[PDB]
Write a protein that binds this DNA or RNA. Structure first.
Lengths: 735, 97, 716, 249
RNA sequence: AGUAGAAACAAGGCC
RNA sequence: GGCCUGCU
């Protein structure tokens, strides 16, 4: 007899055992080298899906741009980006009519937010493409570098501390004859108008790793800092709009998505009488981002912001204006090998414009030949369409408009449709009195989608009777069925620290028990395995064992020293008291009454040199990138113990010409620590104002010395010493 | 505009005394010689070291008039003597010892 | 008017007033009388505060110039002259230290004698109105208020005047100096009334310059300016434009539904080529175990001593010789490496105490076997351009290979029971709730079912091997290291036992990226002759190292005993994911527990015990030439565990792609079997998407064969 | 005394003087987050990889003067080589366990008073009473429920001023809290935590967690109470219901 | 050789 | 041969 697990589906329905079809117990695919090939392929594919448009050359950037809007209507089922302006404007108008007051309200709240938003909001972001160094750097670092360059060039309106003023300075920089940047190898280099325009309109391309569910790798993009404020405002407007649309599912979580899917299916099927047939289409959109033209987003926003202050319209329109002229950096480059001479070489992507094509294979040779005409200063113009879901929310708005355009008031026919859209994925429930009606409805829905630059993937889509469908790895079969294979990768040690890892593991087990219908015995097994892996990872074994490690000696002496050994934490080699009933309690508090007072005091000592807290945002928040989803943050319950240390940093900056960044880091951190000691609320509430550091610090020294004498340790001798030391630092700052 | 009129001055013996007054229609006396500079006498009481004990500045506020008493005058005190206030100056009177 | 503040006031005050001007964001060129008025307010604040000191008594000491000493305390300490944030900082600090009441508006000074605030304001109008005005602005105030006015008059409540009168004569002399100096200037046409409390501003975000031209090039094809396009949008109204283009659009743009029937789906085509080879990092079906029967636990003990003791338990060693060559390497190197390992093992046996971890010599043998100094040296392009052989890295579709029957048998025997328990679980909090007791009983049942399973043994082998390899790579980055493959089990009798499959030599492991490869050489004992399925051992070199005698009724077999030696490699990501193989247990048993719970939701009672003991219900878990064979729930547990283990062992992008694109077709087939009239828009496209994932991986090809068999058995 | 002294020492050196002079208060946050350290994409892989090194964690410089450089057998506990972009020094994990067996001891009696939420959870569970498990299909319907069982009927911003006035009374600024509920909360949490020396930031964070109301969408069947939602994993399942009554009731 | 698979590893750089 | 780094 030959064993075959798949035959199990002959008795258990597919959805009731779908977890077996998710090989999420092995290493996910990773990219190894350059992503330049993928970037070039994506650029060429985006440009050839809109080949029948019209070509122009921008007078500012001098780059060739392709406009397919209002182009010839498609005559085949292949992907097409020839969106029609009038059709999309009409779709938005019908969306407004079905939801009166949506645009005006959303614009009002967006106007409030834009005129009260601060610059620091831009620091709350992941890697961004700093143009000062032409590389990806943390959002805060890139923002600081750009602000420094602007201030050195004379653009100091951002000193007002307002994001709108920062954007005003950004736009004013566009009209400058010559800017100056700094490079280390420090050298001051001058950038002319066109070079700075291209550096501000460019995107950095990388390869996406840890992407499960496809054989081929893809490319993703990261924009600069000049354009992120406009993107933030536009996405704020789009989120405020989608929050008023029940057909959208992008700005919500997973459980809300399931609830809305259940509600829509029940509404569609229940209202349908015996005569009307119902069919569900589990649709995926092929080349979703490559076929969405930024000009159409400009049209949608300018229709949304009608009868609004002109400044609001301008600030919200700046973003799509820059995306329509966006450029993409090709990537890291290409690495060649010569086996005859036994050597390797790495050529940067910027040489692709001039480098001969003898080194490249046929596929890459043709890709380079096709993309060369669009190469301007080492970057390729990508006007026709978006690169990687930067306008997720606006795309969801367009999809929701398409979904609502079939409310049976615009169809003008017996058939009708509804459903749920989340960018690149949708479920469409279509009802009609007969199979011919369903066919006509789906055909018209597809045709209308093709008029908006949205394509339906026929290969990854199928239609059945309502009651069974899929949506973003959520399988609905007369009710959503748990999978538990999507969350399997999150059952190990997170990698934050000991206490954080313990709390995160127990909380993940608890949550997957609540949401993903994890069984009790399975949860107990998960707890046991997690504890085993945790002890084997942090070298913290039970203590009563003879497992020799680098940490087994101190742990054993602590074990033999303690009297009530049941109170020792698993991190210190103690027994595990966790169970299904204790999954919502931190380890420290669960073992508090069992700890010896000496060990308890040594553990939770504020003066410990290991605990370090930076800001209110990073107290008990851990960023865990979930499998098959975007990066997410979790609140984990933990007590600040000596085990809450933060791990070592990379330390490879020491071998790079960018070595002075570490000295600047140290000096900035010293100044920030001094300010915090002067202003204790610096971390919890970020200080605001327009004065400089030393003014506030010296003046508060004055006052605090005064009052702490009026009652406290200070003495006249010390108070006068502080006053004249303040005068000394004053005259020092003078010179 | 507010303006000052010096009174007093003239020729005087060595070791002898003079009374200067300044009428105004912080306050001062100053002097100046050839061969040097504008030289500080007194403020109102604050004086320069070379002049201490010998000259007594004083004021009336009622009839708007300051007084310099100069006792034990010396050849090196031969100068034009001016009054001033806090911005404005007088025309000065000459004291010849 | 600004010429006055150029002339008279000192720098300190003028820049203080200029920063106060910047504070609330209004411009100085439009209205300057406010600047002069508030700078005079600030000046009176200073001149009233300074020159006033206190000593340990009350009765402030007043000195025209602060002498050098510790006695420089200031009688009145200023509030204004600071930013709003700091003004409120001082307010709150004074309230919290003085125990006084917090005012709602900005004071100007604080004093000790009377322990309270002073809000000085000198207005153009006479005092006896401005005083009570600001008083009714401030609610129930104990802070004393004192104001002057240009005429020279003073006033205050309580008839209180807090310090010397010569200072106030100073104040009013300053005041009339101001007055009859504007007399020379001539400003009272507006000086009395120049500020009326204007607060208004319009936000301006103007598109101009280059950024405007960009806006003119981001419009539809037949538009010339953003102004015109916005006007058109504002004037646009729906007039049935989607219908016109829908009618005009070609009818070939359709989404016709192709019915999906029993005869529609065709079997997935498998690639053809040379048979598929073995990819695992260790032997799974052909492993052999040398044991000692020690009482130590899994992690307890020292590796090298245990390995040597286990190997001394076997007698019959012969001089090794080549049996099956690598067919691409230098087998004599493998032979010499094996003899070197034996020699150095003896060398450890001789000395005093067995080292916890041993380093081996870097001979040419393992230099070749571990791929040392073979990475091409990195150079610059400007120095290597004329080399004809210089080209890209080989980037093409992997070699095509057809499925072989060995993977099927390997999976078959990976789901079979064993004579040992390969899982020793940790401790949990004592169960207190009845649901916890039910969970514990279920867990005990599953552990009894799966512990005696080759899948669990493979899990432990992989976890231990990858953990040791990662730790050695991170610790001994430079020097080759010896690691014996150790796994500890427990017999049926209950006696604990150790097992030594072989050895792993880890090489240079300077791993920077998650994809960087660490090469090692693995040696494992076995009894399976490699002359029967040579195509499964394409990358192995197999020697003959001894003879084994296992008790059998046919005299005694005296079988040969071979050594499978190969060069393999891994990476940080692969090591990390292989050291988390225990979650296969989770996956499998979560699936089984979901089955049990779903069935128990029907009958209102827990159904675990009868499922595991009666074994009445069975699921299709394989096909025999006679037909489909069904097994009890325990066999399903073992089968799913083996499937998860093989997923973790043979993981690859092909597996992910095939899994997704075959789950799609499985859902379609399930819809067909449920009588839900399934339909497809392009089924050929889906088939081509599935078939492109099957290239050379044995596991994915076996999964595809299983899928074809399931289709054949289904659709009936 | 000290604080202004390192201020003067910083201003002594030209670079830090320039940083202090030209940098405005508003930019405080930016430069504080200014770092070359990228946020890790795969934390688990490197935590499993770094812990195999010697000196894998980081600690303040003060550790060099509280913990000896080596333990009894000579295993090093800390190193004097500083981190990449900080003055902290890299140390071994043993320095943690050492601190828990011979490090300085204090009085942790006030931690229960600080971490009110967690200890209240423990007390509620310790006195809970379980019941029989009933096996029947549960119709889990998704609903919006409040998870925090100690929220004082305050929002994030609404309680943020309360938290500042409780911890940072001087940086409150204009705000003086009007609602009398906030008055009593301030009084209680002021007199209760008057000398607690854990950290201002952690105290503020835990006060925010305790007082601020927070809500999330979850699949529930029955219950719906704040105390009954924290144990939602233990009382409700796919095909079983476990009757439970927390200690509070 | 080996790992791996649309491009890489099989140490890097600095003296 | 000596020393530096391992997400920069």
């Amino acid at each position: 007899m030959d064993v075959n697990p798949t035959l199990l589906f002959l008795k258990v329905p597919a959805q009731n055992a779908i977890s077996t079809t998710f090989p999420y117990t092995g290493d996910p695919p990773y990219s190894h080298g350059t992503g330049t090939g993928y970037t070039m392929d994506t650029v060429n594919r985006t440009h050839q899906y809109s080949e029948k448009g019209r070509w122009t050359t921008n007078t500012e950037t001098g780059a060739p741009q392709l406009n397919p809007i209002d182009g010839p209507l498609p005559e085949d089922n292949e992907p097409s980006g020839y969106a029609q302006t009038d059709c999309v404007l009409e779709a938005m108008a019908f969306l407004e009519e079905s939801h009166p007051g949506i645009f005006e309200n959303s614009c009002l709240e967006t106007m409030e937010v834009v005129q009260q938003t601060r610059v620091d909001k831009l620091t709350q972001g992941r890697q961004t493409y700093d143009w000062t160094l032409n590389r990806n750097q943390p959002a805060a670092t890139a923002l600081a570098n750009t602000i420094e360059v602007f201030r050195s060039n004379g653009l100091t309106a951002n000193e007002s501390g307002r994001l709108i003023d920062f954007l005003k300075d950004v736009m004013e920089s566009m009209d400058k004859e010559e800017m100056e940047i700094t490079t280390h190898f420090k050298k001051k280099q001058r950038l002319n108008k066109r070079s700075y325009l291209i550096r501000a309109l460019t995107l950095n391309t990388m390869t996406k790793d840890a992407e499960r569910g496809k054989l081929k790798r893809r490319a993703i993009a990261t924009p600069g800092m000049q354009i992120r404020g406009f993107v933030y405002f536009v996405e704020t407007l789009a989120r405020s709009i989608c929050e008023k649309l029940e057909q959208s599912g992008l700005p919500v979580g997973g459980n809300e998505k399931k609830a809305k899917l259940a509600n829509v299916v029940r509404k569609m099927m229940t209202n349908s009488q015996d005569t009307e047939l119902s069919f569900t289409i589990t649709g995926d959109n092929t080349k979703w981002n490559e076929n969405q033209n930024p000009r159409m987003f400009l049209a949608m926003i300018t229709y949304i912001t009608r009868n609004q202050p002109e400044w609001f319209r301008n600030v919200l329109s700046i973003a799509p204006i820059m995306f329509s002229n966006k450029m993409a950096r090709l990537g890291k480059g290409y690495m060649f090998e010569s086996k005859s001479m036994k050597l390797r070489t790495q050529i940067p992507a910027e040489m692709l414009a001039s480098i001969d094509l003898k080194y490249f294979n046929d596929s890459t040779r043709k890709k380079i030949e096709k993309i060369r005409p669009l190469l301007i200063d080492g970057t390729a113009s990508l006007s026709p369409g978006m690169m990687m879901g930067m306008f997720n929310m606006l795309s969801t708005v367009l999809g929701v408009s398409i979904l609502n355009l079939g409310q049976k008031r615009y169809t003008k026919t017996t058939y009708w449709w509804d459903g749920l859209q989340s960018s690149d994925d949708f479920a469409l429930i279509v009802n009609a009195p007969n199979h011919e009606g369903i066919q006509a409805g789906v055909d018209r829905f597809y045709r209308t989608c093709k008029l908006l630059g949205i394509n339906m993937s026929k290969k990854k889509s199928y239609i059945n009777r309502t009651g069974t469908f899929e949506f973003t790895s959520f399988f609905y079969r007369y009710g959503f069925v748990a999978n538990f294979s999507m969350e399997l990768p999150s059952f190990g040690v997170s990698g934050i620290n000991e206490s954080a890892d313990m709390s995160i593991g127990v909380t993940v087990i608890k949550n997957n028990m609540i949401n993903n219908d994890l069984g009790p015995a399975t949860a107990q097994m998960a707890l046991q395995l997690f504890i085993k892996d945790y002890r084997y990872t942090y070298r913290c074994h039970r203590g009563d064992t003879q497992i020799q490690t680098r940490r087994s000696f101190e742990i054993k002496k602590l074990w033999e020293q303690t009297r009530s050994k049941a109170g020792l934490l698993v991190s210190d080699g103690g027994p595990n008291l966790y169970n299904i009933r204790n999954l919502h309690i931190p380890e420290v508090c669960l073992k508090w009454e069992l700890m010896d007072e000496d060990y308890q005091g040594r553990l939770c000592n504020p003066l410990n040199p290991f605990v370090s807290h930076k800001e209110i945002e990073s107290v008990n928040n851990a960023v865990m990138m979930p499998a098959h989803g975007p990066a997410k943050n979790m609140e984990y319950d933990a007590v600040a113990t000596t085990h809450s240390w933060i791990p070592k940093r990379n330390r490879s900056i020491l071998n790079t010409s960018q070595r002075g960044i570490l000295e600047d880091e140290q000096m900035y951190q010293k100044c920030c620590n001094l300010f915090e000691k002067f202003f204790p609320s610096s971390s919890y509430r970020r200080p605001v104002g327009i004065s400089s550091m030393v003014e506030a610090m010296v003046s508060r020294a004055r006052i605090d010395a005064r009052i702490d004498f009026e009652s406290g340790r200070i003495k006249k001798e010390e108070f006068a010493e502080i006053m004249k030391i303040c005068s000394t630092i004053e005259e020092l700052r003078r010179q | 505009q507010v303006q000052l009129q010096e009174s007093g001055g003239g020729l005087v013996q060595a070791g002898d005394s003079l009374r200067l007054s300044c009428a105004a229609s912080i306050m001062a006396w100053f002097r100046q010689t050839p061969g040097k500079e504008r030289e500080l006498v007194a403020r109102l009481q604050y004086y320069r070291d070379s002049v201490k004990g010998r000259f007594t500045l004083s004021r009336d506020n009622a009839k708007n008039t300051l007084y310099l008493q100069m006792n034990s005058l010396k050849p090196e005190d031969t100068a034009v003597y001016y009054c001033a206030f806090t911005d404005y100056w007088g025309q000065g009177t000459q004291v010849t010892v | 008017m600004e010429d006055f503040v150029r002339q008279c006031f000192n720098p300190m005050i003028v820049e203080l007033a200029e920063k106060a001007m910047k504070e609330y964001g209004e411009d100085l060129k439009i209205e300057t009388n406010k600047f002069a008025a508030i700078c005079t307010h600030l000046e009176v604040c200073f001149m009233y505060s300074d020159f006033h000191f206190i000593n340990e008594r009350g009765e402030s000491i007043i000195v025209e110039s602060g002498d050098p000493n510790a006695l420089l305390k200031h009688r009145f300490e200023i509030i204004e002259g600071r930013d709003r944030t700091m003004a409120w900082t001082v307010v709150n600090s004074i309230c919290n230290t003085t125990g006084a009441e917090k005012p709602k508006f900005l004071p100007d000074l604080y004093d000790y004698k009377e322990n309270r605030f002073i809000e000085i304001g000198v207005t153009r109008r006479e005092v006896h109105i401005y005083y009570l005005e600001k008083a009714n602005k401030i609610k129930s105030e104990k802070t004393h208020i004192h104001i002057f006015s240009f005429t020279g008059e003073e006033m205050a409540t309580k008839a209180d005047y807090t310090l010397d009168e010569e200072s106030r004569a100073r104040i009013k002399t300053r005041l009339f100096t101001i007055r009859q100096e504007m007399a020379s200037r001539g400003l009272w046409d507006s000086f009395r009334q120049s500020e009326r409390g204007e607060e208004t501003i319009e936000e301006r975000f103007e598109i101009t310059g280059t950024m405007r031209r960009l806006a003119d090039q981001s419009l539809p094809p037949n538009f010339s300016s953003l102004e015109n396009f916005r006007a058109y949008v504002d004037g646009f109204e729906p007039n049935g434009y989607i219908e016109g283009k829908l009618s005009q659009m070609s009818k070939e743009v359709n989404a016709r539904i192709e019915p999906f029937l029993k005869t529609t789906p065709r079997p997935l085509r498998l690639p053809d080529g040379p048979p598929c080879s073995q990819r695992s990092k260790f032997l799974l079906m052909d492993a052999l175990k040398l044991s000692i029967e020690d009482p130590s636990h899994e992690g307890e003990g020292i590796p090298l001593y245990d390995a040597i003791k286990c190997m001394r338990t076997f007698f019959g060693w012969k001089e090794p010789n080549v049996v099956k060559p690598h067919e691409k390497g230098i087998n004599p190197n493998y032979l010499l490496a094996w003899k070197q390992v034996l020699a150095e093992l003896q060398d450890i046996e001789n000395e005093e105490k067995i080292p916890k971890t041993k380093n081996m010599k870097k001979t040419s043998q393992l230099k070749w076997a571990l791929g040392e100094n073979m990475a091409p040296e990195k150079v610059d392009f400007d120095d290597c351009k004329d080399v004809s052989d210089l080209k890209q890295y080989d980037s093409d579709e992997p070699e095509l290979r057809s499925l072989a029957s060995w993977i099927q048998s390997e999976f078959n025997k990976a789901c079979e029971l064993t004579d040992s328990s390969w899982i020793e679980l940790d401790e949990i909090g004592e169960d207190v709730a009845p649901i916890e007791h039910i969970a514990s009983m279920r867990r005990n049942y599953f552990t009894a079912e799966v512990s005696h399973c080759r899948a669990t043994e493979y899990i432990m082998k992989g976890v231990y091997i990858n953990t040791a390899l990662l730790n050695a790579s991170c610790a001994a980055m430079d020097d080759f290291q010896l690691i014996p493959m150790i796994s500890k089990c427990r017999t049926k009798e209950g006696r604990r036992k150790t097992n030594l499959y072989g050895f792993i030599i880890k090489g240079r492991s300077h791993l920077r990226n998650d994809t960087d490869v660490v090469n090692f050489v693995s040696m494992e004992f076995s009894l399976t002759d490699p002359r029967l399925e040579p195509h499964k051992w394409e990358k192995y070199c197999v020697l003959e190292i001894g003879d084994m005698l296992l008790r059998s009724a046919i005299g005694q077999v005296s079988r040969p005993m071979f050594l499978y030696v190969r060069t393999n490699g891994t990476s940080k990501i692969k090591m990390k994911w292989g050291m988390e193989m225990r979650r296969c247990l989770l996956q499998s048993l979560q699936q089984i527990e979901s089955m049990i719970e779903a069935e128990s939701s029907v009958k209102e009672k827990d159904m675990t015990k009868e499922f595991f003991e009666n074994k009445s219900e069975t699921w299709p878990i394989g096909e025999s030439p006679k037909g489909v064979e069904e097994g009890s729930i325990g066999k399903v547990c073992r089968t799913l565990l083996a499937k998860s283990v093989f997923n973790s062992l043979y993981a690859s992008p092909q597996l992910e792609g095939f899994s997704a694109e075959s789950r799609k077709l499985l859902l379609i087939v399930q819809a067909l079997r449920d009588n839900l009239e399934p339909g497809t828009f392009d089924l050929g496209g889906l088939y081509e998407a599935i078939e492109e994932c099957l290239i050379n991986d044995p596991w994915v090809l076996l999964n595809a064969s299983w899928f074809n068999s399931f289709l054949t058995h289904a659709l009936r | 005394m000290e604080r202004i002294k390192e201020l003067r020492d910083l201003m002594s050196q030209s670079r830090t003087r320039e940083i202090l002079t030209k940098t405005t208060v508003d930019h405080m946050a930016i430069i504080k987050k200014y770092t070359s350290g990228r946020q890790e994409k795969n934390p688990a892989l490197r935590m499993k990889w770094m812990m195999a090194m010697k000196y894998p964690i980081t600690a303040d410089k003060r550790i060099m003067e509280m913990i000896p450089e080596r333990n009894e057998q000579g295993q090093t506990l800390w190193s004097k080589t500083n981190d990449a972009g900080s003055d902290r020094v890299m140390v071994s994990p043993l320095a943690v366990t050492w601190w828990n067996r011979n490090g300085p001891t204090t009085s942790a009696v006030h931690y229960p008073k600080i971490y009110k939420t967690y200890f209240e959870k423990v007390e509620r569970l310790k006195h809970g009473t379980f019941g029989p498990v009933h096996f029947r299909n549960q119709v889990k319907i998704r609903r919006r429920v409040d998870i925090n069982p100690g929220h004082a009927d305050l929002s994030a911003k609404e309680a943020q001023d309360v938290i500042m006035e409780v911890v940072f009374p001087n940086e409150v600024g204009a705000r003086i809290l009007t609602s009398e509920s906030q008055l009593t909360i301030t009084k209680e949490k002021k007199e209760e935590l008057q000398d607690c020396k854990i950290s201002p930031l952690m105290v503020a964070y835990m006060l925010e967690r305790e007082l601020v109301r927070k809500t999330r969408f979850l699949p529930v069947a029955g219950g719906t109470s704040s105390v009954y939602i924290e144990v939602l994993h233990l009382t409700q399942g796919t095909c079983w219901e476990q009757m439970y009554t927390p200690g509070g009731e």
